[PDB]
Design a protein around this ligand. Structure first.
Ligand SMILES: [Cl-]
Ligand SMILES: [Cl-]
Length: 278
């Protein structure tokens, strides 16, 4: 509370630390007038833990994709501060892809087949695709290992963790279908050209806002207000340039508005439905 703690859900804190510290170092001095003297970074392995941190006041501010964000809001532990633009894109969506030699051409043909997902905190790699399956009445049971098989009439999913693993398992004929964001598709660390050329997109979800800054329930309203002001000013401060590049290539922030609120509310309903029916 004299300290501002910035976090995110991370499966790779060694690497994500570097993404957060530069902007935290930019923010902290600019919050002195609301009692902030110092900054810390605290990441969490998953949404549940991060929700616990948030609820207990151990993390103040996270920058997350909107689905994860809604997991946090649903648990009562955080609320939106700013909508976040990353790599010049305000929105993203999930794509389902297969090997081009697969006999799958549509989402409906996932029945009988396996899907690679990421982890439960992933928007584009779990929440969105699972939501999509729910809307289309496509059952998708958790599979225990790559030797496990779906019931006939149903799909099944395997959690492979990383985005590269989704691409790799599908490429290597271990899993029939993969889910990634449309942005991930064009990001060569996640979707290597050597794999991508063997893939076909079979389905696209509707776009949602891509990312959002969340602050914890009970943050002091003056800290909240000033944080918002500081981030809003960052996008056009040259002294914030390198820090924002490191911060998931943040290219913009903007105030919440009735549209983004409505879109987060619809996404939140969808996430809740996924949560309720898994
Ligand atoms: Cl995501
Ligand atoms: Cl929006």
């Amino acid at each position: 509370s004299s300290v501002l703690v910035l976090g995110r859900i991370s499966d790779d804190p060694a690497s994500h630390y570097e993404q957060l510290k530069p902007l935290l170092d930019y923010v902290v001095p600019r919050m002195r007038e609301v009692g902030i003297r110092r900054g810390e970074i605290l990441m969490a392995p998953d949404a549940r833990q991060m929700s616990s941190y948030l609820r207990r006041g151990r993390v103040d501010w996270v920058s997350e994709t909107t689905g994860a964000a809604m997991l946090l809001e649903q648990r009562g532990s955080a609320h939106p501060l700013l909508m976040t633009e990353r790599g010049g894109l305000r929105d993203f969506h999930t794509l389902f892809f297969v090997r081009r030699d697969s006999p799958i051409h549509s989402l409906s043909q996932l029945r009988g087949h396996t899907l690679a997902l990421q982890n439960a905190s992933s928007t584009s790699g779990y929440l969105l695709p699972m939501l999509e399956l729910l809307r289309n009445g496509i059952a998708c049971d958790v599979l225990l290992s790559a030797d496990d098989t779906p019931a006939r009439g149903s799909a099944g999913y395997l959690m492979v963790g990383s985005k590269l693993n989704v691409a790799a398992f599908v490429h290597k004929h271990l899993i029939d279908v993969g889910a990634l964001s449309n942005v991930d598709w064009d990001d060569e660390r996640h979707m290597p050209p050597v794999f991508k050329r063997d893939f076909r997109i079979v389905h696209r979800t509707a776009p949602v806002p891509r990312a959002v800054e969340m602050v914890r329930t009970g943050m002091d309203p003056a800290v909240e207000q000033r944080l918002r002001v500081v981030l809003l000013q960052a996008a056009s401060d040259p002294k914030a340039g390198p820090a924002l590049k490191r911060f998931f290539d943040t290219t913009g922030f903007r105030p919440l508005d009735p549209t983004s609120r409505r879109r987060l509310q619809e996404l939140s309903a969808g996430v809740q439905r996924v949560r309720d029916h898994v």
